[PDB]
Scaffold this active site. Structure first.
Site, short mmCIF file in Angstrom:
data_model
loop_
_atom_site.label_atom_id
_atom_site.label_comp_id
_atom_site.label_asym_id
_atom_site.label_seq_id
_atom_site.Cartn_x
_atom_site.Cartn_y
_atom_site.Cartn_z
N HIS A 60 0.85 -1.20 0.00
CA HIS A 60 0.00 0.00 0.00
C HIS A 60 0.88 1.24 0.00
O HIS A 60 1.54 1.52 0.99
CB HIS A 60 -0.97 -0.03 1.19
CG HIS A 60 -1.91 1.11 1.21
ND1 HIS A 60 -2.81 1.37 0.15
CD2 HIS A 60 -2.14 2.10 2.13
CE1 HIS A 60 -3.50 2.47 0.43
NE2 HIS A 60 -3.09 2.97 1.62
N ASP A 62 0.97 5.24 -0.34
CA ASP A 62 0.22 6.51 -0.26
C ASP A 62 0.92 7.60 -1.05
O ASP A 62 2.07 7.94 -0.75
CB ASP A 62 0.13 6.99 1.18
CG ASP A 62 -0.71 6.06 1.99
OD1 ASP A 62 -1.86 5.80 1.55
OD2 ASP A 62 -0.21 5.60 3.03
N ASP A 174 -8.08 1.14 1.35
CA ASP A 174 -7.87 2.18 2.38
C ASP A 174 -8.84 3.36 2.43
O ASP A 174 -8.79 4.07 3.43
CB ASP A 174 -6.46 2.74 2.33
CG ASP A 174 -5.97 3.21 3.70
OD1 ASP A 174 -6.37 2.58 4.71
OD2 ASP A 174 -5.17 4.24 3.69
N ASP A 311 1.50 -1.28 4.43
CA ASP A 311 2.01 0.03 3.95
C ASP A 311 3.47 -0.07 3.52
O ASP A 311 4.31 -0.51 4.34
CB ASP A 311 1.88 1.12 5.01
CG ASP A 311 0.45 1.48 5.35
OD1 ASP A 311 -0.46 0.76 4.95
OD2 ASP A 311 0.30 2.53 6.01
N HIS A 441 -6.75 9.39 -0.96
CA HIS A 441 -7.41 9.30 0.35
C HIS A 441 -6.63 9.97 1.49
O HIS A 441 -7.14 9.92 2.63
CB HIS A 441 -7.80 7.84 0.67
CG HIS A 441 -6.63 6.92 0.72
ND1 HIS A 441 -6.21 6.21 -0.40
CD2 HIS A 441 -5.79 6.61 1.74
CE1 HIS A 441 -5.15 5.51 -0.09
NE2 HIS A 441 -4.83 5.73 1.21
C1 KFT Z 1 -2.08 3.86 13.07
C2 KFT Z 1 -0.64 3.80 12.54
C3 KFT Z 1 -0.45 2.84 11.39
C4 KFT Z 1 -0.95 3.38 10.08
C5 KFT Z 1 -1.27 2.35 9.01
N1 KFT Z 1 -1.71 2.97 7.74
C6 KFT Z 1 -2.97 3.35 7.57
O1 KFT Z 1 -3.83 3.34 8.47
C7 KFT Z 1 -3.32 3.86 6.16
N2 KFT Z 1 -4.54 4.69 6.32
C8 KFT Z 1 -4.02 6.06 6.44
C9 KFT Z 1 -5.08 7.10 6.30
O2 KFT Z 1 -4.57 8.40 6.44
C10 KFT Z 1 -2.96 6.13 5.34
O3 KFT Z 1 -3.53 6.36 4.05
C11 KFT Z 1 -2.32 4.75 5.43
O4 KFT Z 1 -2.07 4.18 4.13
ZN ZN Z 2 -3.51 4.78 2.51
#
Ligand code: KFT
Ligand code: ZN
Length: 989
Positions: A60, A62, A174, A311, A441
């Site tokens: 994933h 971003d 996501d 991620d 997003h």
């Molecule tokens: C809580 C800390 C770990 C984060 C893991 N990553 C996410 O939760 C994804 N969602 C986010 C939204 O802002 C961001 O896009 C990430 O790609």
């Molecule tokens: Zn994301």
């Protein structure tokens, strides 16, 4: 065409009905915290019926969040893609999916030729499979459908051009809740399947229990089902490896092989992964297969999807090694041991869907049908993600401005082929990509770090400038006689004048037209109308003198109004002596241009009136505070309180004064509970009234307004002869842990029902649920919302996506801004303390609907009236305004497009885009036609886009991305049904 009003679709799962029936009880389900202890019959699987398991490695990425696009590209993504290319090339049975084409394009163009060919080889053989293939994985709440299509088109055009592939499977793991706008666009863009993840934990549990996590998702109005797209909803809390192997994350975590050795990651459940060996493979395999079989119980086929990723995963060659070799050891063992009755391998997303399709064709399953949406998402307890419907509202508003500028620049420049020296294509590609990027997003959502929001803003500002340059060059070409037209493509022929972005109260940057009896008595101005119908709209310009009169280019007088220029600075207004607003009605052809002339005189001219100004506070006139009534034109009559806020609307001289009260209120943050941040809205009870001022009343023949300086908001109601326009200059300043809401209070007996839109495409019925918390009753308001009873509707249209609700019968409310001192523990690692002043814009439409044909009370959709749809069009696609830069315009034409057809009001040319550069011997132009559905209340030419341009050789109906021909058209005429979107490509010799 289907009737989308009288006929109600039959679906297995209608989400409004599901929410009404669901308890939403947050029960402890065990190891699957938000589900239950899954059981399976071990005899289900045997030599005759095996479980087919596809492990789908992913990463994933971003496009901006904690780092900028370019920061992540340099520090993370280029290494992921370089390692993917090396490892897939070297390991033919390894597989990987890729979603974000913004990153893939950035990477691919930097490769040497040898590496570009190696990359083509692993795409051609299906090892590296693109999923969705949009520029980004967009937000689905705040995003306009036009920009969802733009970014999908940007990615897929790139993939067709450079990789010769077009994804038919979508991957959206996501976005914070999911919209049916996505299957709508995907299904009209050749897609066969899609996958979603972030739905409310209670909805996952309810659908899992019924094996309804795979469903044919159709639009709420679709009786026939031709919009249906096969959708896979993932069952668990996350897409990470602990929440994708099966229901017990303590077990699944032991099969994320990056969470051992040197990588600095671990399992929070405190049992580490272990390297698979001959000594442990039988026990490790039994533990994992048991997880897979539990997950398989939630789905109808014997084909199981097991995502493997997280991620920015697959960044190191060692990570590829440990995941590949340990899973290979498991697969080799599982596949060689008959007792498991499993075949397991690495696969792709399309591979999974193809296998599921085959199982369906074999008679294994019949899938349920579903309509509705998956808003508002909660990942746990009462933590509803309705905050990001409002977070960073300056950039949310900027999105809609750049949406319009891209459309106008593409349309104005499409009329001609341009020499490559003009760099039209370079500037439009830049503008499309900066807008596309912001659909991410963490872009429009307002969920990125401050420097990343600054990077998005700088990108969008460069995009706006790129669109300005293309638009002004295009206008000069369209309205200059060809015998004279001799362009300098570096020259500014026109300056744009935008009254609503950023807004003079936010940025005092409008150009003042300097007129003078000596040296420059007159100025040419030009209006563009991107909509395919004749339009009249008041326009305004700043002029250096109040003595200004307006004509067309034939020197016909045009009635005008001069108003003073006011600014706000206790909060009080001040009048300019340096500039004046000249206001007049512009009449512009469909997809066309009209030229007017501003002329100075030594005294008040015959056809220009002068607004009066009244200042109310506890020649300009002064007064004690008092209730006031105003009427412009044949438009409604509005009454205002002593504090300058609407209190009633009288539609006609013979109708009653209907109470409609505007109020500003504030929400706070919990002292003890979970804290609101960029994502979560966790109010500390109902909103409390804002403590309240100077009221400025400007009264004109053409335009009147009531403005009031309140704490944190300069609130303005503008009257031009139909639905008023509301403008809020919102400055939350240093009000930590505050969310400012604008609320409307009426006697409309709406009960618990209200309507909000999805992506500017469709209106969906909402029911307020007192069994849920306040924040669960907040929905996205990407372009409008309404309430109605048997007789009366009130619609609020927006120029920007914000969060809103109806928290009581007869109310609407919409959040303006929010300032949060605390982080809400979703990864951003900051609150929201980077607010800045934003000009929000609305239209307010009160209507009688007792003579309208409304849907049955079982229909899950609502439809705008003609008045409300035009009001929304006025906000999102106003007339563009151009000021001629030089003193003389030899060869000036008064009009362009006076012969264009004026299409029915429910039809829009959403997109006009020349698809070919000037070197192409066959020129191609793409059009997206959208037909909405308007309520019929008892209140034009045929548009054939393939004939808008001369020398047509061919007319094709295409997918909405323009990439596939669906139908060669008879006589090269372009036919579309209500609620349908069609695309056409015209080819020209
Ligand atoms: C809580 C800390 C770990 C984060 C893991 N990553 C996410 O939760 C994804 N969602 C986010 C939204 O802002 C961001 O896009 C990430 O790609
Ligand atoms: Zn994301």
């Amino acid at each position: 065409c289907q009737d989308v009003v009288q006929d109600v679709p039959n679906v297995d799962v209608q989400m409004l009905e599901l929410y009404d029936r669901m308890s939403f009880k947050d029960i402890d389900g065990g190891v699957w915290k938000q589900g239950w202890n899954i059981k399976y019959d071990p005899l289900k699987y045997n030599a005759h019926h095996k479980l087919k398991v596809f492990v789908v490695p992913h990463s994933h990425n971003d496009p901006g969040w904690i780092q900028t696009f370019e920061e992540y590209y340099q520090h993370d993504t280029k290494h992921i893609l370089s390692n993917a290319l090396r490892h897939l090339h070297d390991n033919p049975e390894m597989k990987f999916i890729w979603a974000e084409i913004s990153y893939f394009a950035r990477f691919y163009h930097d490769l040497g030729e040898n590496k570009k060919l190696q990359m083509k080889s692993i795409v051609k053989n299906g090892q590296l499979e693109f999923v969705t293939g949009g520029w980004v994985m967009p937000d689905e709440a705040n995003s306009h459908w036009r920009n969802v299509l733009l970014q999908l088109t940007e990615g897929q055009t790139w993939l067709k051009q450079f990789m010769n592939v077009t994804p038919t499977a979508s991957w959206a793991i996501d976005p914070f809740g999911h919209s049916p706008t996505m299957p709508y666009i995907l299904q009209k863009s050749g897609f066969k399947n899609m996958l979603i993840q972030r739905t409310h934990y209670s909805v996952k549990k309810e659908l899992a229990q019924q094996r309804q996590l795979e469903f044919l998702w159709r639009q709420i109005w679709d009786n026939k089902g031709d919009t249906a797209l096969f959708t896979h909803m993932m069952p668990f809390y996350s897409y990470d490896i602990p929440h994708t192997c099966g229901p017990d994350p303590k077990v699944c975590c032991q099969f994320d092989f990056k969470r051992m050795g040197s990588f600095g990651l671990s399992c929070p459940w405190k049992v580490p992964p272990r390297t698979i060996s001959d000594q442990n493979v039988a026990a490790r395999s039994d533990l994992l297969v048991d997880q897979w079989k539990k997950k398989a119980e939630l789905y109808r086929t014997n084909v199981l999807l097991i995502p493997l990723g997280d991620d920015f995963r697959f960044k190191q060659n060692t990570e590829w090694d440990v995941q590949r070799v340990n899973y290979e050891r498991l697969f080799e063992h599982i596949n060689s041991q008959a007792h498991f009755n499993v075949q397991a391998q690495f696969g792709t997303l399309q591979e999974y869907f193809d296998a599921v399709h085959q199982a369906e064709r074999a008679g294994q399953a019949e899938f349920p049908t579903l309509s509705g949406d998956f808003f508002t998402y909660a990942d746990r307890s009462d933590n509803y993600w309705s905050g990001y419907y409002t977070s960073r509202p300056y950039h949310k508003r900027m999105d809609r401005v750049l949406m319009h500028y891209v459309r106008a620049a593409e349309m104005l420049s499409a009329w001609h082929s341009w020499d490559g020296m003009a760099r039209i294509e370079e500037r439009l590609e830049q503008a499309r990509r900066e807008l596309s990027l912001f659909q991410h997003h963490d872009g429009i959502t307002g969920t990125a770090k401050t420097h990343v929001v600054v990077d998005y803003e700088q990108r969008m500002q460069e995009a706006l400038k790129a669109c300005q340059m293309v638009m002004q060059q295009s206008v000069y070409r369209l309205l200059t006689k060809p015998s004279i037209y001799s362009p300098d493509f570096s020259f500014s022929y026109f300056t744009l004048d935008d009254s609503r972005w950023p807004g003079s109260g936010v940025e005092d940057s409008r150009t003042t037209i300097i007129l003078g009896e000596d040296i420059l008595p007159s100025k040419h101005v030009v209006m563009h109308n991107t909509l395919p119908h004749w339009r009249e709209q008041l326009v305004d310009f700043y002029v250096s003198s109040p003595f200004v009169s307006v004509t067309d280019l034939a020197n016909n007088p045009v009635e005008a109004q001069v108003s003073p220029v006011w600014s706000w600075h206790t909060i009080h207004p001040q009048g300019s002596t340096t500039k004046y607003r000249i206001i007049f009605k512009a009449r512009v052809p469909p997809m066309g241009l009209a030229t007017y002339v501003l002329t100075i005189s030594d005294s008040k001219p015959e056809h220009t009136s002068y607004a009066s100004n009244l200042l109310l506070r506890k020649d300009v006139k002064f007064g004690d505070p008092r209730e006031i009534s105003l009427r412009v034109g044949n438009g409604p009559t509005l009454a205002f309180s002593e504090q300058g806020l609407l209190k009633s609307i009288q539609l006609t001289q013979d109708s009653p004064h209907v109470p409609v009260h505007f109020k500003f209120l504030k929400y706070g943050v919990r002292s003890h509970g979970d804290r609101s941040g960029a994502y979560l809205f966790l109010p500390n009870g109902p909103a409390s009234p804002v403590e309240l001022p100077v009221v400025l009343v400007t009264k004109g023949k053409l335009e009147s307004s009531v403005s009031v300086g309140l704490p944190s908001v300069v609130h303005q109601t503008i009257m031009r002869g139909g639905a008023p326009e509301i403008r809020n200059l919102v400055d939350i300043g240093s009000l930590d842990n505050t969310e400012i809401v604008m609320r409307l209070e009426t006697h409309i007996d709406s009960g618990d029902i209200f309507y909000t839109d999805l992506n500017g495409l469709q209106f969906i019925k909402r029911r307020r649920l007192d069994k849920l918390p306040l924040q669960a009753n907040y929905y996205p308001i990407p372009s409008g919302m309404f309430i109605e009873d048997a007789n009366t509707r009130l619609t609020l249209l927006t120029g920007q996506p914000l969060g809103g609700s109806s928290l009581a019968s007869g109310e609407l409310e919409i959040m303006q801004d929010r300032r949060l001192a605390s982080d809400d523990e979703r990864g951003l690692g900051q609150g929201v303390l980077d607010n800045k002043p934003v000009l929000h814009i609305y239209r307010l439409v009160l209507e009688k609907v007792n003579n309208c044909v409304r849907p049955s009370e079982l229909h899950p959709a609502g439809y705008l009236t003609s008045a409300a749809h035009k009001a929304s069009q006025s906000l999102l696609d106003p007339l563009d305004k151009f000021i001629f830069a030089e003193n003389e315009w030899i060869g000036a034409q008064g009009q362009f497009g006076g012969d264009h057809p004026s299409a029915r009001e429910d039809l829009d040319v959403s997109v006009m885009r020349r698809l070919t550069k000037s070197s192409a011997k066959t020129q191609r132009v793409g059009y997206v036609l959208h037909r909405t559905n308007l309520m019929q209340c008892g209140t034009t030419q045929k548009l054939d886009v393939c004939h808008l341009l001369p020398n047509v050789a061919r007319c094709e109906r295409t997918t909405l991305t323009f990439l596939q021909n669906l139908e060669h058209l008879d006589g090269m005429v372009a036919p579309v049904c209500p609620m349908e979107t069609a695309a056409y490509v015209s080819s020209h010799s």
